[model samples]
Target chain A: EEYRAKTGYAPYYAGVWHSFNNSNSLVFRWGSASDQIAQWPTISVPRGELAFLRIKDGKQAAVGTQPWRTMVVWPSGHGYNIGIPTYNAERARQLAQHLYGGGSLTDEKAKQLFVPANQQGPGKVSNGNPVWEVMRAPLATQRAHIQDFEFIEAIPE
Target chain B: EEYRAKTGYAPYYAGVWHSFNNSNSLVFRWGSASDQIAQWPTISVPRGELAFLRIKDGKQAAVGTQPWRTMVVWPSGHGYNIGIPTYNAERARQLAQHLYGGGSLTDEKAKQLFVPANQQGPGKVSNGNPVWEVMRAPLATQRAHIQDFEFIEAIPE
Candidate 1:
C-alpha cells in the first residue's frame, strides 16, 4: 500500500517463485515494468548486456545505478521489468538459468536464454509467471529455510 | 542474507501465508520460537494480554523494538511462535478470529480463543499449518495486491 501509493510499485506475492527453467532455484520477481503499464519506467542495459526493452523503443532506459536499475529481472521476452533490490545481478543470472535452462555468465551467453513475451505458451507459465512446486507442506514451511536472504548466501559455501 | 547475519532472524518464504481461519488474507510467518528450539524466546505480554508462550518456558525471548517481535503468527496450538511485524495486535485479532473461527476482542475473549499447543487434531488442518487455496498461478501473483505492509494497515480503515 505505502509502496504502491508512494512509489507506485507493488510487490510480488509473499511466497511466489518464478522459474524460466526447471532448476531447483527460484526467484521472487518483485517489480514489473508492465504491472503498472502506464507508470512503468524506462529500462536500459550496457550495450552488450541483455536489455528487456530496447532503448530504440523509446520508453525511458538507463544504465546500472539509474533510478530504476537497482534490482531487476528482465524475463526473456517479457517487456516488463521486475525489480527486487535483494536480487542482485548474480542472483538474476542464476534465476534466469533456472527458468530457461542452459546459459552462462559471459555477457553474450546470458542474453540467449531470455524468456520472450508469451514464451510460456499463454498461461501455463510466462516471462514473469509464478511457478511453484507441488504442495507438500504449508507454503511457509516449504519456504522457511530458504527464505532467509543470508541462508542463500551460505549455501554455495 | 545480511538481515539474518545482522539480526540473527530468518525471513519467511517469499510467498508463504499462514491461516488461522479460512479467510483469503495471507501473511508471512517470520518467527518461530521453536523452529530453532534452543533459540526460542520466553515471551511476555502485558498483564492481561494474550501471551503465546508462558514465560516459564524460557528458551529465549525479548521485549519490543527488538528484531524478534514483528508480524508474528501464533499458528493455533503450535508451540512455536511465527512472527511477521506487519501483523500487529488488531490485525492479529482479525487473523485469530479468521483462523479459530468466532471470537471477539476483550481481554477475556482474546485469551479464551488462544490456540492451545498441538490442537490441530492430528494432521487435518492443524494450528500452524498453512493451508492455501488451490494454486492457479505463481504464488506471487496470488499475493500481488495483498503483499504490502501498507495494505495490511488499510484494512481497518
Candidate 2:
C-alpha cells in the first residue's frame, strides 16, 4: 500500500509546493542588468529573454519565496511589460522556446498563447480575462527572485 | 456503492468553501455591547476580536466575536463561546452544555463558565482589553460564526 501510494505522479517539491494567488502589480527581482548574477537582487531584463514572468492581477497575498517558475509551463497569454537587465539576443530565443515549449497553452509550433480578454470576440481583455506573459529566456542579471509577492483583492494604486 | 462514491459526505450547500490553509476565522457581522443592547451604531470588529487569545498553554486562538466570551458547559466543564449573533444567552448555554460540556478549564468554580474574555482574569479591565470586549446577557448583538476553530502559533499582544 505504501509503494502504491508513492507510485502516482507527485510534484518535484512536495511540502515546498505552495499556491500564490495575487491580483496586483508586483516587482520581481531577477538577474541585474549590470551586476554579476550571484545573489538575489532586483534587476531588469531585456524583453523576450525572461524564462517566466509572474502575471499579477493585484497586490494582495501572503508574501513568501517559492520559485514556482518551473511550473509556469507556458504563457497564459496575459498582458505584461518586459523591463531592464536582459539576455543576449541569441539566448533570448532559446529561453523563449524553453518557457513556451509545446505545453497545454502552446500551439503545435510551440508559440506562446493566451485566452483573449473577452468572450466578445477573438482577442481582447475580457472582464474576467486570464492573461499570460511569455518569456524567451532568463533575465541577464544575477538576481533570480521576486521581492514582495503580495496578494491583494484589488490592484493597489 | 456508486451512489456513495458520487455523494458521500457531500455538503448540501452549493456555495464554494474558502480554500485558505490553517484556521481561517469565519466572517460574520458582530454586534458590539451597545448593538446587543440596541444603544450604539454597529461597528466592524476587526483586529482585536479576530486575533489570537491565550486559551491553552500550547494553543492561541482567535475568537469568533468581540470580547472573547465563551459559553459554559454544565457537566464535564468543557466550554466554548458561540459566535455572538447565532444564539442568545440561554441558547448559548444550552448549546455549550449540549456539545462540549464536562471538561472544564479547571480554574475557580465561580469563573468556570464564561465567554471571550473571563470577566475576572488578572489582566481584564472594566472597559475590557481593547482587543477583547465583554458579552452581557441583556444586550442583543450580532457576531461572527465560529467553526474550524484553531490554535494560533503565537499569543496575542
Candidate 3:
C-alpha cells in the first residue's frame, strides 16, 4: 500500500536536503576582480528549489568583480575561468523563470521578485521572505568599484 | 539591418563550447573514490547539447562493474560524486533523456547524439563496436575508481 502511494505522484527516492546542505560558512566570490578563493563556491541546488545562492551571491559582490569569472576546472585539477557576464536580479528572474517555467517570461512579473540589498537587513536573510535582495560584498577589502560600501572587515584573501 | 537580424533570433551571444573547452589532458574523476583535486570540474555544454560527457564517462568503464559514477561538478568547484548507475547502452539512453531536458523535461526521446570516440582507428572490441572510449588519470593515482575494459594509453596524474 505504501509503495504504491509513494510512486504514484513523483518519482520516489524522495528525500529532503538543504540547498547548500546547511553550511553557513559556504561563501560565494561573486564577479571577482581579484584572485577568487572561497570556502564553498560550487553550490548544489536541486530542481526548482528557489536558488538561494543567487541571492547569496548578490551579497558577495565586493569579493569579486562584474561579470562572474567562475573558474572552469576539469577532472584533471586544471582549470581556467569563464565569464558569465551578468547576474543581477534580472538574470535571477530569468533563470528562475526558466527553471520553474512561467506564463510571463516576457513581462514584468519576473522583475518584482527582487529588491535592493542595502534595503534588506542586518541579520539572517531569506527564510520566509517573499522577495529577493541584491547587494555588494564588503569593499576596500578598497574604496572599490564597491564605492564606500567598505569591505573593510578582515577578508582572508 | 545587421544588428536587427542578430537581435531578432534568440537572446544573442550564442556560441558552442565543450565541457572540456578544449584539452585532452582533462579527464573525469567519475565517482572520485578519493581526493578529487580538479581545480576545474565544469564541462560546459549548451542547455541541451547532447551532453557528450555522459557517453565519455560510460566509455571509461573498465571491463567490470555494472553501475556508473558520474562526477557532477558545478561552476564554483565543490562538486561531489553520483551513481545514477547501472551498465548498458540503454541506461545511458534514459539518463541522457533526463539531462537533455532543461527544455520541457522528462520523456523517452531526450537522448543526445554522439559519434564513435575512435573513428577509423582500426581497433574494435567488446559487444557492438567499442561503443565509445575514455581516459583515466593513471592508476595508483588513488584518485579514481575501478573499471576493466581497456582505458586509453596513459593519462598523467
Candidate 4:
C-alpha cells in the first residue's frame, strides 16, 4: 500500500487464507485490529509510481538497495500493505509472483502452499534468502498468507 | 521427570513466579491445566540415577547421542517436567543452571535475562543452541522462562 507517510516500515499485509470455524488458522487472531494493533510501521512508496499496490509482475519491488517497502494486495478491492526487503528487486518480484501471481490462492487450488505463521520457527529455513513456494492455508480461507518470513532474509545459497 | 513411558518427550514445567495484575507476562496463560492443555510429550530419564531433576551443578544433562529428555523443576515442593535435547550434557547443564541456578530469579535481579516466548522468532537465535542468562518476565513474573528454544540447537561455536 502507498502509505500516507514516508518514514517507517509498513504494516503486515496479513489476511485470512480462509477461516475454519472463524477460528481457522490465521492469527488464531481471535482479536481485531484494535486489540491486536500494536503500532506496526506504515510504508512509504514513491508517490509518483504509486498505483496503490502491485504484485503482478514483481513490478516495482525495487532494483537496488532499497530497504523494505510496503506491497499491497487488493483482495476485497481495498489495498493492504505488507513489507519485506529484497536485496535484488528480482527476488522480491519472484516473491511477489510466487505469492500473488495467480491471484486468490483458492483459485489455484493451493491452500496447502504456505506455512502457517505460528508454525514458523528458528529451525525453519528457505533455500533462498526467502523460501520459495508461497504457502497458502487450507484452500478455503481465500486470503493471502503473509508469512513471518517477510522480515526474514533469504537463507544463504 | 523420570517417565514411565519410554516413547515421548516431557511436559512443560510451567509455574507462576509472582502475580501482578494477575494477567502476568508468563503465557498470559489466562486459564489453567484444562483449557491450555496440549499433548506435549513426556520425557524418559535414565533409571539408574532417578533423582527426579537436577540443575544446580548441571548434573545429568547427559552427554553425546542423547535426544531430548525431561528435566524437572520443583516449585512449591512439587516436581514439574520440561524437556529439551543436548548434543553435549554440559550444554544442557549450562542451560539448566542458566535457567534455574540461582533457585528463584527474583534473587538475581536477572529478570531481563530472556526473550519472552511471544517475542521469539525465526530471527532470534542464542549464540548457543539454547540462549543463556535465562529470561524472567519483568522481575515480577518470577517463573523461569522456558523458551521455545527447547528444540533449537546451538549456533556453531
TM-scores for chain A over all candidates:
0.25, 0.17, 0.21, 0.25
RMSD of each: 19.1, 22.5, 25.7, 22.7
Residue B54 lDDT in model 3?
A: 31
Residue B89 CA displacement from its true place in model 2, Å: 21
Query: Lowest-lDDT window of 10 residues in candidate 3 chain A?
Result: A139-148
Q: Tens digit of lDDT per residue, candidate 3, span B30-103?
A: 22234322232223332213232232434433222221222222221134211122234444444443343221
Error of 4 at A48 (Å): 19
User: What is the C-alpha lDDT profile of model 3 across A1-157, one tens digit per residue?
Assistant: 0111111121111111122112211222221234232222222222222222232333322222232211111011213211111235455434343322322212354323322222212222212211113221211110111111111122221
Which model scores highest in DockQ? Answer: 1
What is every candidate's C-alpha DockQ against the true complex, given to 2 decimals? 0.03, 0.01, 0.01, 0.01
lDDT of 2 by residue, A78-127 (tens): 33222111122233344344443323322332222221112112111112
Can you write out model 2's per-residue Cα lDDT over B91-142, one digit (the tens) per residue?
Answer: 4443333323223333333232333232212321112111222222212223
After superposition, candidate 3 runs with Cα above 4 Å error: A1-157, B1-34, B37-41, B52-60, B66-86, B100-157
Worst 10 residues of 1 chain A by lDDT: A133-142
lDDT of each: 0.27, 0.23, 0.23, 0.27
Error of 1 at B155 (Å): 20
The TM-scores of all predictions, comma-separated, are 0.19, 0.16, 0.20, 0.18
